[PDB]
């Protein structure tokens, strides 16, 4: 219940990473009901975004940083389920449901 101490090693940290991913995935049906996503996105797409998020941070080697990321993820998930801030194609911070990029940026504005 209380905030646990900082992880000793990457095995402890990974056990915690797996525990969080399990909790995040198990709440997916609750989210789908709250935001009425039955005709917007698939539950696996929600799972992919969560596992993606975790895979983008696979280069972290410091267990303290991993603990902070897990804590922030747990906080973010709790808000999404309890205090939903509904936006159409957006759940929290996740978008749900012949020329190079330079010329597009050039056409848009002078600030890239």
């Amino acid at each position: 219940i209380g905030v646990p101490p900082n992880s000793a090693n990457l095995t402890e940290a990974r056990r915690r990473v797996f525990d969080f991913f399990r909790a995040a995935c198990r709440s997916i049906p609750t989210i789908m009901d709250i935001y009425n996503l039955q005709d917007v996105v698939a539950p696996s797409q929600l799972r992919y975004a969560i596992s993606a998020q975790i895979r983008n941070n696979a280069h972290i080697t410091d267990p303290k940083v991993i603990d902070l990321l897990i804590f922030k993820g747990m906080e973010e998930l709790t808000d999404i389920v309890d205090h939903a801030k509904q936006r159409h194609h957006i759940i929290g911070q996740y978008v749900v449901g012949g020329k190079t990029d330079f010329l597009k940026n050039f056409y848009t504005s002078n600030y890239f």
Binding site: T100, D101, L103, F106
Partner: peptide, 24 residues
């Protein structure tokens, strides 16, 4: 609607069909 000078010449070059090896 002004732009930086190097940006305008690179943009023109792309339109004119020349690929300069830089985008920034």
């Amino acid at each position: 609607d002004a732009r930086d000078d190097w940006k305008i010449v690179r943009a023109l070059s792309e339109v004119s069909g020349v690929k300069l090896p830089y985008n920034s």
